[PDB]
RNA sequence: GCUCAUUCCAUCUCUUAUGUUCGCCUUAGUGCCUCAUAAACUCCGGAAUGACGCAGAGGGUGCUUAUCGUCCACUGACAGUCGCUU
């Protein structure tokens, strides 16, 4: 799969985050952490499939972030 | 093309009664005739077009939606130089 840096939520970030352009995913989280995620882009390329931390809910009338 | 309401070219002509005043005559004559109140028809020396048919001639009609004009600012992407390492 794939995970853009920007898509990440507070749970993935450490309690002590820092703002220096925040480009540092190693600083955000060390790998292996358990994850919560929904299918985002149907894999349709040799490139990875895309996924987002921000999940969504499909309600008949409503949609929840 | 044929033949024709057409188009833009055709050279092409006249009238009765209204009351009146002044220029003039008939000698009454209701006038000849200036002013002057309204009513009343036509007619061929070019060059285009439409009107049928010559000749081609094998979907329509009515009414129900369209909300989108201005204006204000988070902003994104797996495919040589060197600043680098172990």
């Amino acid at each position: 799969g794939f995970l853009p840096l920007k898509e990440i939520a507070r749970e993935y970030f450490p309690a002590n985050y820092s703002a220096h352009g925040r480009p540092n995913i190693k600083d955000v989280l060390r790998e292996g952490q358990e994850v919560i995620v929904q299918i985002d882009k149907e894999e349709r390329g040799n490139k990875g499939a895309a996924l987002t931390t921000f999940i969504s809910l499909a309600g008949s009338y409503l949609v929840l972030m």
Side-chain angles (χ1 to χ4, degrees), chain A residues 1-4 6 8-9 14-16 18-19 21 23 27-28 31-32 35-37 40-41 44-46 48-62 64:
Chain A
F2 209 93
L3 177 62
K6 63 188 185 308
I8 299 185
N16 315 339
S18 181
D27 299 10
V28 164
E31 54 184 357
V35 316
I36 42 183
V37 61
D40 163 64
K41 295 275 188 193
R44 63 159 191 77
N46 185 259
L51 302 170
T52 59
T53 299
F54 303 164
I55 55 172
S56 171
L57 259 66
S60 60
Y61 288 61
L62 310 172
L64 158 68

